[PDB]
Amino acid sequence: QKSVLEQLKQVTMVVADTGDFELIKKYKPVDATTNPSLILKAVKEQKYSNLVAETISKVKANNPDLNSDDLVKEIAIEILVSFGIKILDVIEGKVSSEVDARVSFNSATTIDYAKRIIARYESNGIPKDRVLIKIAATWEGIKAAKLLQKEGINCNLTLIFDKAQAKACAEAGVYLVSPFVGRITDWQMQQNNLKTFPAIADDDGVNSVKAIYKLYKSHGFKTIVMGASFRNVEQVIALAGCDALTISPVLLEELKNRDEHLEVKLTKNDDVVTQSPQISEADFRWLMNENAMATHKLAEGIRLFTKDTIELENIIKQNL
Ligand SMILES: *[C@@H](CO)[C@@H](O)[C@H](O)[C@H](O)COP(=O)(O)O
Protein backbone atom coordinates (compact mmCIF):
# COMPACT_ATOMS: atom_id res chain seq x y z
CA GLN A 1 0.00 0.00 0.00
CA LYS A 2 2.90 2.40 0.74
CA SER A 3 4.33 4.25 -2.24
CA VAL A 4 7.61 3.05 -3.71
CA LEU A 5 9.03 6.45 -2.68
CA GLU A 6 8.19 5.97 1.00
CA GLN A 7 9.55 2.42 0.94
CA LEU A 8 12.79 3.52 -0.74
CA LYS A 9 13.26 6.13 2.00
CA GLN A 10 13.52 3.42 4.68
CA VAL A 11 16.47 1.68 2.96
CA THR A 12 18.14 4.48 1.00
CA MET A 13 18.83 8.17 1.60
CA VAL A 14 16.51 9.85 -0.93
CA VAL A 15 18.03 12.97 -2.55
CA ALA A 16 16.29 15.38 -4.99
CA ASP A 17 18.22 16.28 -8.17
CA THR A 18 17.12 19.81 -9.12
CA GLY A 19 17.81 23.52 -8.85
CA ASP A 20 14.08 24.29 -8.60
CA PHE A 21 13.35 24.28 -4.90
CA GLU A 22 9.59 24.57 -5.44
CA LEU A 23 9.43 20.98 -6.71
CA ILE A 24 11.35 19.55 -3.71
CA LYS A 25 9.17 19.94 -0.61
CA LYS A 26 6.36 17.62 -1.72
CA TYR A 27 8.83 14.69 -2.02
CA LYS A 28 10.50 15.34 1.34
CA PRO A 29 13.98 14.24 0.31
CA VAL A 30 16.78 14.26 2.91
CA ASP A 31 19.42 16.01 0.75
CA ALA A 32 19.41 17.72 -2.69
CA THR A 33 21.89 18.05 -5.53
CA THR A 34 22.38 20.75 -8.14
CA ASN A 35 24.82 20.82 -11.04
CA PRO A 36 25.67 23.53 -13.61
CA SER A 37 23.02 22.34 -16.10
CA LEU A 38 20.31 22.29 -13.39
CA ILE A 39 21.27 25.81 -12.25
CA LEU A 40 21.11 27.08 -15.86
CA LYS A 41 17.70 25.41 -16.29
CA ALA A 42 16.41 27.08 -13.12
CA VAL A 43 17.80 30.50 -14.09
CA LYS A 44 15.84 30.36 -17.38
CA GLU A 45 12.53 29.54 -15.66
CA GLN A 46 10.27 32.61 -15.73
CA LYS A 47 9.30 32.11 -12.09
CA TYR A 48 12.91 32.95 -11.08
CA SER A 49 13.36 35.94 -13.41
CA ASN A 50 13.43 38.37 -10.46
CA LEU A 51 15.70 36.35 -8.13
CA VAL A 52 18.35 36.55 -10.89
CA ALA A 53 18.02 40.35 -11.40
CA GLU A 54 18.11 40.77 -7.60
CA THR A 55 21.38 38.83 -7.34
CA ILE A 56 22.84 40.95 -10.14
CA SER A 57 21.88 44.15 -8.27
CA LYS A 58 23.01 42.98 -4.84
CA VAL A 59 26.43 41.75 -5.98
CA LYS A 60 26.83 44.74 -8.32
CA ALA A 61 26.02 47.20 -5.52
CA ASN A 62 28.27 45.47 -2.95
CA ASN A 63 31.25 45.31 -5.34
CA PRO A 64 31.40 48.65 -7.19
CA ASP A 65 35.19 48.30 -7.66
CA LEU A 66 35.34 44.88 -9.38
CA ASN A 67 36.39 44.83 -13.04
CA SER A 68 33.61 43.54 -15.31
CA ASP A 69 34.99 39.97 -15.64
CA ASP A 70 35.35 39.56 -11.84
CA LEU A 71 31.83 40.96 -11.32
CA VAL A 72 30.38 38.27 -13.60
CA LYS A 73 32.27 35.48 -11.77
CA GLU A 74 31.01 36.84 -8.47
CA ILE A 75 27.43 37.04 -9.67
CA ALA A 76 27.60 33.46 -11.03
CA ILE A 77 28.75 32.08 -7.67
CA GLU A 78 26.08 34.07 -5.78
CA ILE A 79 23.39 32.66 -8.11
CA LEU A 80 24.61 29.11 -7.49
CA VAL A 81 24.55 29.75 -3.74
CA SER A 82 21.16 31.56 -3.89
CA PHE A 83 19.49 28.49 -5.43
CA GLY A 84 21.22 26.25 -2.85
CA ILE A 85 19.91 28.44 0.00
CA LYS A 86 16.35 28.28 -1.34
CA ILE A 87 16.72 24.49 -1.44
CA LEU A 88 18.13 24.34 2.09
CA ASP A 89 15.05 26.26 3.28
CA VAL A 90 12.81 23.30 2.34
CA ILE A 91 14.89 20.26 3.36
CA GLU A 92 16.55 19.06 6.59
CA GLY A 93 19.78 17.86 5.01
CA LYS A 94 22.53 19.01 2.70
CA VAL A 95 22.72 20.55 -0.74
CA SER A 96 25.45 19.92 -3.33
CA SER A 97 26.83 22.96 -5.25
CA GLU A 98 29.35 22.35 -8.08
CA VAL A 99 32.57 24.24 -8.70
CA ASP A 100 33.06 25.96 -12.04
CA ALA A 101 33.87 23.13 -14.48
CA ARG A 102 36.71 25.18 -15.95
CA VAL A 103 38.92 24.46 -12.91
CA SER A 104 38.52 20.67 -13.34
CA PHE A 105 42.24 20.08 -14.17
CA ASN A 106 43.69 22.42 -11.56
CA SER A 107 43.66 21.25 -7.93
CA ALA A 108 44.75 24.63 -6.51
CA THR A 109 42.00 26.64 -8.25
CA THR A 110 39.43 23.89 -7.52
CA ILE A 111 40.32 24.29 -3.83
CA ASP A 112 40.03 28.11 -4.16
CA TYR A 113 36.61 27.89 -5.87
CA ALA A 114 35.35 25.36 -3.32
CA LYS A 115 36.29 27.73 -0.48
CA ARG A 116 34.65 30.71 -2.22
CA ILE A 117 31.42 28.66 -2.35
CA ILE A 118 31.70 27.90 1.37
CA ALA A 119 32.47 31.59 2.08
CA ARG A 120 29.31 32.78 0.27
CA TYR A 121 27.10 30.27 2.12
CA GLU A 122 28.67 31.39 5.42
CA SER A 123 28.13 35.08 4.56
CA ASN A 124 24.46 34.19 4.07
CA GLY A 125 24.20 32.57 7.52
CA ILE A 126 24.16 28.97 6.31
CA PRO A 127 26.08 26.46 8.46
CA LYS A 128 28.90 24.95 6.42
CA ASP A 129 27.89 21.36 7.38
CA ARG A 130 24.79 21.78 5.19
CA VAL A 131 26.85 22.07 2.01
CA LEU A 132 28.64 19.57 -0.19
CA ILE A 133 31.03 20.90 -2.85
CA LYS A 134 30.59 18.96 -6.09
CA ILE A 135 33.81 18.30 -8.00
CA ALA A 136 34.48 16.39 -11.21
CA ALA A 137 36.41 13.20 -10.42
CA THR A 138 39.43 13.88 -12.61
CA TRP A 139 42.73 13.10 -10.89
CA GLU A 140 43.07 16.80 -10.09
CA GLY A 141 39.54 17.00 -8.65
CA ILE A 142 40.19 13.99 -6.40
CA LYS A 143 43.49 15.54 -5.28
CA ALA A 144 41.62 18.78 -4.39
CA ALA A 145 38.94 16.84 -2.48
CA LYS A 146 41.70 15.11 -0.51
CA LEU A 147 42.96 18.52 0.74
CA LEU A 148 39.41 19.84 1.27
CA GLN A 149 38.39 16.86 3.42
CA LYS A 150 41.55 17.21 5.54
CA GLU A 151 40.37 20.76 6.21
CA GLY A 152 36.82 19.60 7.13
CA ILE A 153 35.12 20.59 3.88
CA ASN A 154 32.86 17.77 2.65
CA CYS A 155 32.89 16.94 -1.05
CA ASN A 156 30.65 15.19 -3.56
CA LEU A 157 32.83 13.68 -6.28
CA THR A 158 30.83 13.58 -9.49
CA LEU A 159 31.12 12.37 -13.12
CA ILE A 160 32.22 8.96 -11.88
CA PHE A 161 32.12 6.34 -14.63
CA ASP A 162 34.73 3.76 -13.60
CA LYS A 163 35.53 1.74 -10.46
CA ALA A 164 39.12 3.15 -10.41
CA GLN A 165 37.81 6.68 -10.00
CA ALA A 166 35.56 5.42 -7.26
CA LYS A 167 38.43 3.69 -5.44
CA ALA A 168 40.67 6.78 -5.72
CA CYS A 169 37.87 8.97 -4.31
CA ALA A 170 37.40 6.63 -1.34
CA GLU A 171 41.17 6.57 -0.76
CA ALA A 172 41.10 10.38 -0.59
CA GLY A 173 38.53 10.16 2.24
CA VAL A 174 35.77 11.87 0.27
CA TYR A 175 32.43 12.27 2.05
CA LEU A 176 30.37 11.11 -0.92
CA VAL A 177 30.69 9.87 -4.50
CA SER A 178 28.14 10.18 -7.31
CA PRO A 179 28.60 7.28 -9.71
CA PHE A 180 26.45 7.91 -12.79
CA VAL A 181 23.92 5.48 -14.13
CA GLY A 182 22.09 7.25 -16.94
CA ARG A 183 24.94 8.60 -18.98
CA ILE A 184 26.45 5.13 -19.11
CA THR A 185 23.10 3.74 -20.29
CA ASP A 186 23.07 6.64 -22.85
CA TRP A 187 26.45 5.49 -24.24
CA GLN A 188 25.34 1.86 -24.29
CA MET A 189 22.22 2.81 -26.29
CA GLN A 190 24.12 5.14 -28.69
CA GLN A 191 26.75 2.46 -29.52
CA ASN A 192 24.11 0.32 -31.24
CA ASN A 193 21.33 2.83 -31.94
CA LEU A 194 19.15 1.16 -29.31
CA LYS A 195 15.75 2.82 -28.94
CA THR A 196 14.50 1.10 -25.83
CA PHE A 197 16.32 0.89 -22.53
CA PRO A 198 18.15 -2.38 -22.02
CA ALA A 199 16.74 -4.88 -19.53
CA ILE A 200 17.86 -3.97 -15.97
CA ALA A 201 20.25 -6.93 -15.71
CA ASP A 202 21.98 -5.72 -18.91
CA ASP A 203 22.00 -1.99 -18.02
CA ASP A 204 25.66 -0.88 -17.95
CA GLY A 205 24.87 2.13 -15.73
CA VAL A 206 23.00 0.12 -13.12
CA ASN A 207 25.77 -2.50 -13.12
CA SER A 208 28.43 0.20 -12.68
CA VAL A 209 26.83 1.49 -9.45
CA LYS A 210 26.29 -2.13 -8.26
CA ALA A 211 30.01 -2.88 -8.82
CA ILE A 212 31.11 0.33 -7.04
CA TYR A 213 28.75 -0.35 -4.14
CA LYS A 214 30.20 -3.87 -3.81
CA LEU A 215 33.79 -2.51 -4.05
CA TYR A 216 33.14 -0.01 -1.26
CA LYS A 217 31.49 -2.38 1.21
CA SER A 218 34.09 -5.16 0.72
CA HIS A 219 36.91 -2.63 1.38
CA GLY A 220 35.20 -0.98 4.34
CA PHE A 221 35.17 2.45 2.71
CA LYS A 222 32.99 4.92 4.60
CA THR A 223 32.43 7.22 1.63
CA ILE A 224 28.72 7.42 0.83
CA VAL A 225 27.73 5.83 -2.47
CA MET A 226 25.07 7.95 -4.13
CA GLY A 227 23.76 6.75 -7.47
CA ALA A 228 23.03 9.67 -9.81
CA SER A 229 21.87 10.38 -13.39
CA PHE A 230 18.68 8.40 -14.05
CA ARG A 231 16.64 7.84 -17.18
CA ASN A 232 13.75 5.72 -15.83
CA VAL A 233 12.22 4.58 -12.50
CA GLU A 234 13.27 0.95 -12.99
CA GLN A 235 16.93 2.01 -12.77
CA VAL A 236 16.23 3.67 -9.42
CA ILE A 237 14.21 0.68 -8.14
CA ALA A 238 17.06 -1.66 -9.18
CA LEU A 239 19.38 0.16 -6.78
CA ALA A 240 17.12 0.13 -3.70
CA GLY A 241 19.37 -0.30 -0.64
CA CYS A 242 22.14 1.90 -2.03
CA ASP A 243 23.43 4.39 0.57
CA ALA A 244 21.81 7.22 -1.33
CA LEU A 245 20.18 7.99 -4.65
CA THR A 246 19.68 11.42 -6.22
CA ILE A 247 16.58 11.53 -8.40
CA SER A 248 14.84 14.09 -10.64
CA PRO A 249 11.43 15.44 -9.58
CA VAL A 250 10.02 13.73 -12.69
CA LEU A 251 11.17 10.31 -11.42
CA LEU A 252 10.34 11.15 -7.80
CA GLU A 253 6.76 11.81 -8.94
CA GLU A 254 6.64 8.37 -10.55
CA LEU A 255 7.95 6.75 -7.34
CA LYS A 256 5.40 8.68 -5.27
CA ASN A 257 2.45 7.55 -7.38
CA ARG A 258 3.07 3.81 -7.58
CA ASP A 259 2.46 1.46 -4.64
CA GLU A 260 3.90 -1.94 -5.51
CA HIS A 261 6.19 -3.57 -2.97
CA LEU A 262 9.84 -2.57 -3.11
CA GLU A 263 12.54 -5.24 -2.76
CA VAL A 264 15.93 -4.13 -1.45
CA LYS A 265 18.70 -5.14 -3.87
CA LEU A 266 21.91 -3.74 -2.33
CA THR A 267 22.88 -4.65 1.21
CA LYS A 268 25.81 -4.23 3.61
CA ASN A 269 27.61 -7.20 5.21
CA ASP A 270 30.02 -8.38 7.93
CA ASP A 271 32.63 -9.93 5.60
CA VAL A 272 36.35 -9.69 6.31
CA VAL A 273 37.58 -6.33 5.00
CA THR A 274 40.01 -6.32 2.05
CA GLN A 275 42.93 -3.88 2.43
CA SER A 276 44.34 -3.13 -1.04
CA PRO A 277 47.21 -0.90 -2.16
CA GLN A 278 46.26 2.65 -3.07
CA ILE A 279 45.79 3.69 -6.70
CA SER A 280 48.66 5.82 -7.99
CA GLU A 281 48.17 8.64 -10.47
CA ALA A 282 49.77 6.56 -13.25
CA ASP A 283 47.56 3.51 -12.44
CA PHE A 284 44.49 5.74 -12.38
CA ARG A 285 45.24 7.36 -15.75
CA TRP A 286 45.96 3.99 -17.30
CA LEU A 287 42.76 2.36 -16.03
CA MET A 288 40.64 5.35 -17.09
CA ASN A 289 42.19 5.22 -20.55
CA GLU A 290 41.27 1.53 -20.91
CA ASN A 291 37.63 2.41 -20.25
CA ALA A 292 36.66 4.15 -23.52
CA MET A 293 33.22 5.10 -22.21
CA ALA A 294 34.58 6.57 -18.92
CA THR A 295 37.27 8.72 -20.57
CA HIS A 296 34.70 10.03 -23.02
CA LYS A 297 31.88 10.70 -20.51
CA LEU A 298 34.15 12.39 -17.96
CA ALA A 299 35.61 14.63 -20.69
CA GLU A 300 32.18 15.33 -22.21
CA GLY A 301 30.64 16.04 -18.79
CA ILE A 302 33.28 18.70 -18.15
CA ARG A 303 32.80 20.19 -21.65
CA LEU A 304 29.00 20.25 -21.33
CA PHE A 305 28.94 21.76 -17.85
CA THR A 306 31.42 24.40 -19.09
CA LYS A 307 29.09 25.25 -21.94
CA ASP A 308 26.20 25.74 -19.49
CA THR A 309 28.34 27.84 -17.15
CA ILE A 310 29.39 30.04 -20.10
CA GLU A 311 25.74 30.38 -21.09
CA LEU A 312 24.95 31.51 -17.51
CA GLU A 313 27.75 34.08 -17.72
CA ASN A 314 26.30 35.40 -20.98
CA ILE A 315 22.85 35.70 -19.38
CA ILE A 316 24.52 37.68 -16.56
CA LYS A 317 26.34 39.92 -19.09
CA GLN A 318 23.07 40.49 -21.01
CA ASN A 319 21.49 41.79 -17.78
CA LEU A 320 24.39 43.65 -16.18
C1 LIG B 1 25.08 15.64 -9.10
C2 LIG B 1 25.67 14.30 -8.65
O1 LIG B 1 25.41 14.12 -7.25
C3 LIG B 1 23.92 15.45 -10.06
O2 LIG B 1 23.20 16.67 -10.12
C4 LIG B 1 24.37 15.00 -11.45
O3 LIG B 1 25.13 16.02 -12.11
C5 LIG B 1 23.13 14.64 -12.27
O4 LIG B 1 22.42 13.63 -11.56
C6 LIG B 1 23.46 14.15 -13.68
O5 LIG B 1 22.24 13.81 -14.34
P1 LIG B 1 22.16 13.82 -15.93
O6 LIG B 1 23.06 12.71 -16.42
O7 LIG B 1 20.72 13.54 -16.24
O8 LIG B 1 22.64 15.20 -16.31
Automatic annotation (TrEMBL):
- The answer to whether the entry has keyword Secreted is no
The answer, when asked if Translocase is one of the entry's keywords, is no
Annotated catalysed reactions: D-sedoheptulose 7-phosphate + D-glyceraldehyde 3-phosphate = D-erythrose 4-phosphate + beta-D-fructose 6-phosphate
Pathway assignment reads: Carbohydrate degradation; pentose phosphate pathway; D-glyceraldehyde 3-phosphate and beta-D-fructose 6-phosphate from D-ribose 5-phosphate and D-xylulose 5-phosphate (non-oxidative stage): step 2/3
Gene3D superfamilies under this entry?
Answer: Aldolase class I
Give its E.C. classification number: 2.2.1.2
Q: Name the GO cellular-component terms.
A: cytoplasm
Q: What UniProt keywords are attached to this protein's entry?
A: Pentose shunt, Schiff base, Transferase
The family classification in the record reads: Belongs to the transaldolase family. Type 1 subfamily.
PANTHER family, from UniProt? TRANSALDOLASE
- Protein name listed in UniProt: Transaldolase
Q: What is the lineage of its organism?
A: Bacteria, Pseudomonadati, Pseudomonadota, Gammaproteobacteria, Thiotrichales
Query: Which gene is the coding source of this polypeptide chain?
Result: talA
